[PDB]
Design a protein around this ligand. Structure first.
Ligand SMILES: CCNC(=O)N1CCC(Nc2ncc(I)c(-c3c[nH]c4ccccc34)n2)CC1
Ligand SMILES: [Cl-]
Length: 336
């Protein structure tokens, strides 16, 4: 047989024999993931077993979308698909899908805990922006960027793991309040991640959206009439009846005490970093900085290389299907 089975991290992995010494490296709702040695390629890989891809239409659509996009997209800051397989021989027996990807060293949740380094932080932010720019050019607007679905190598090279559309702390006001969104909906999420790299605290924590919104207005201030008028009347009423906050200024939100101190370079960078935060963490998306403009910001633009930023977009998600239909769709996709 060309497969073998091993129990790993309380799941059964049935994989190609090329893949050896499977070790659990974590899990998500999307599936459980192992590190493995690929004997054919002489390199370590990550293997994801999709957890109950057919349990419902939501799972199926996500699995199909992930598979097709990860195949189509080829960018250095988006995780790339190395191989895909199922151990089952027929569509009727078809049950499991295995994704093989490059093995990364850590997700951002770990890196975020490290002591702030301007070189590191600006480089990570630059790469996130490059990945997001590339997704957007393909019509992919993520809406759920968060530290746990962003991964990095020991050398600080960074890749986004998924394609978006449970932790809700990184979601934009227009998403929370149901206003509709544009491309810079993803910039708010970057801003939350950056704010967290600085404070080592979740910016907008909260048991629920009510709690979350309170943290937003307490720190950033009650939004302007311009913004209010763009809300549904019914939503408008709740938001307007909250206590009015003047925002904390960004110097108070992100004081000098949180940044490397006592050199000229360090003074320079703290102010630049705060300026960028001030442009990303903007409640009204009409006033929030774009991806392209963020890449031009002095804090970010030191890393700018046209060959990384200006890559051609891929040339390829509203249709519904039965679970049986999605299954055949996924199967043919697996069989290439
Ligand atoms: C908080 C620190 N994180 C950490 O130490 N690790 C996570 C990432 C991991 N590397 C990897 N490399 C490739 C992939 I694809 C995935 C991965 C994809 N989906 C996941 C879901 C949960 C955990 C890991 C993954 N993960 C190494 C171990
Ligand atoms: Cl809620």
């Amino acid at each position: 047989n060309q497969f073998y089975s091993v129990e790993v991290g309380d799941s059964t992995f049935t994989v190609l024999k090329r893949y050896q010494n499977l070790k659990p490296i974590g899990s998500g709702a999307q599936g459980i993931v192992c590190a493995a040695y690929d004997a054919v390629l002489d390199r370590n890989v990550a293997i994801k077993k999709l957890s109950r891809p057919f349990q419902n239409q939501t799972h199926a659509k996500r699995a199909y979308r992930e598979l097709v996009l990860m195949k189509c997209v080829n960018h250095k800051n988006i995780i790339s698909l190395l191989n895909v397989f199922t151990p089952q021989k027929t569509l009727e027996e078809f049950q499991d899908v295995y994704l093989v990807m490059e093995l990364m060293d850590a997700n951002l949740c770990q890196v975020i805990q490290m002591e702030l380094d301007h070189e590191r932080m600006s480089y990570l932010l630059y790469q996130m922006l490059c990945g997001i720019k590339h997704l957007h050019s393909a019509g992919i607007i993520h809406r759920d960027l968060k530290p746990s679905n962003i991964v990095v190598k020991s050398d600080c090279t960074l890749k986004i793991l998924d394609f978006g559309l449970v932790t809700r702390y990184y979601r934009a006001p227009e998403v929370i309040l149901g206003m509709g969104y544009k491309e810079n909906v993803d910039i708010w999420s970057v801003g939350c991640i950056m704010g967290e790299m600085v404070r080592h605290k979740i910016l907008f924590p909260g048991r629920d959206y009510i709690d979350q919104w309170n943290k937003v207005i307490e720190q950033l201030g009650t939004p302007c009439p311009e913004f209010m008028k763009k809300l549904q009347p019914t939503v408008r009423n709740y938001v307007e009846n909250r206590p009015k906050y003047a925002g904390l200024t960004f110097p108070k939100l992100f004081p000098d005490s949180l940044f490397p101190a006592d050199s000229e370079h360090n003074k320079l960078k703290a102010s630049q970093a705060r300026d960028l935060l001030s442009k990303m963490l903007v409640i009204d998306p009409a006033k929030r900085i774009s991806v392209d403009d963020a890449l031009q910001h002095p804090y970010i633009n030191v890393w700018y290389d046209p060959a990384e930023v200006e890559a051609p977009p891929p040339q390829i998600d509203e249709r519904e299907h039965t679970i049986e239909e999605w299954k055949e769709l996924i199967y043919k996709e697996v069989m290439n």
